[PDB]
Amino acid sequence: LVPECFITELVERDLKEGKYAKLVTRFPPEPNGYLHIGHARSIVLNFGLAQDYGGECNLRFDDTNPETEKEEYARAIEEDVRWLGFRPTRVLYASDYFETMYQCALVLIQEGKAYVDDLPEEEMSELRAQGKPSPYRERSVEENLELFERMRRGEFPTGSRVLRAKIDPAHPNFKLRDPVLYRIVHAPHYHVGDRWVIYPMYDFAHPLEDFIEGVTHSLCTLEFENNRTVYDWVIENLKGKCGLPTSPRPHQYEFARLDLSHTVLSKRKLIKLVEGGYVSGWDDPRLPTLRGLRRRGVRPEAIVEFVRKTGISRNEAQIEMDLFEEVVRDDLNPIAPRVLGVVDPLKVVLTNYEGEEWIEAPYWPRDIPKEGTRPLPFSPELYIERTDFSLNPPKGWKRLAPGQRVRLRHAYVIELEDVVEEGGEVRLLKARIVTLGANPEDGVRPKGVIHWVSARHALPVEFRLYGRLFRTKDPEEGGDFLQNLNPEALVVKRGFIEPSVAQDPEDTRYQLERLGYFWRDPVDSRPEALVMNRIVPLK
């Protein structure tokens, strides 16, 4: 479930040489937000690798920051992983490892390898900048334990003091100039309540949670390539202590962040969109949250395929939204039954037809190896798209117009008799059936086929037409990102659909001919007042 990549090569070489008995990976998101389509890459990579190689993968909540983290985000994270179809071997919480990380810390302090620092942020980084040592650096092992302990009791306030690793303040690598191991927050944790007041930094917690769980390959994105030298440091200096293995050890590997055109994934901006009412909420289908894509109608299978199709590499190349949209169409093609709806309704009267009939109509075209039919009703009163009639039609006009006849899909051929106007625009069409299952006798075929419904049987529907969220490929770095929003991101139209849809399961996903793929919005739709999101348009 992962194409051969630079990683798949390296896992095989390790397993085959018995460096690790099993592959163990993890997906380790912070529970402070909802997952987007980017996180899908890490999900499929890390979980697929497990099943691909009969290994294990931990769903771990890297919950080291009490300010922002909430249990509902961790509920949601698991809902979104399981929804893409992956079965965590284990669901863990880094926070449940805090006692071990703390004890590890004590060991670093004992061994003259950490120290407590009183200087505030600004001065601390201006000294790093100068490669100078904090004056507090060379404190006695004793002094450090005593103050760390006071830190733990909560005697000092938020920010006031940290523990740093003593590596080298003048070090060629800036990340190694005594990085902060522990900070102070007087704030409760959603998982571990009010127990903790010192909390570890990412660069300390991650390797340790890695190590504790016996992760073998730790896969993360290229942002953390610079964080490798500190990761190694934690493991090497703590291996064999506090119940930890002496061997084997986890090793980090970086792959390329996904970057999707006409979309943004930077949490900061996503927050602006939501709180700004640019978007309705986090599961709004305009969003590339996994929440919103589920609601939009995209099948998890489409997302996993997309991720597998784009592959895994160091190719920072931004992916084009065409591509994603095309994998969705592709995914829906063989399983979305085809029906008729109208989105811009224009009424047509037939003067030479009376009564009703019901036409047997196939859900599936010649290409699809699925048979299946439905009763489709016809009457003297219909709606068509306003967009499929014209008084002044262009050269290649394949649709209805004052001379030109047209094929109602799965039914008769019609021609314009009369146009009825009001307010300088077109209000109704009077037309004439010519042809059911047969060409026109006189041989002048209709140049094209249009969809329709009987005004006499059609159900009303609120269609939500979702476009791409931005008109520019690179809103993320383009500068004015809100001035690049697409005003057609959502177009709400009130239309009609053939009544057959009422006898379907509510998660049925349709293609409405000549419009795109659609399904009932799972939140709002009610059978007595249908609401239908467009999943993706046609090509």
Ligand SMILES: [Cl-]
């Ligand atoms: Cl090693």
Ligand SMILES: [Cl-]
């Ligand atoms: Cl009648």
Ligand SMILES: [Cl-]
């Ligand atoms: Cl066909």
Ligand SMILES: [Cl-]
């Ligand atoms: Cl037809």
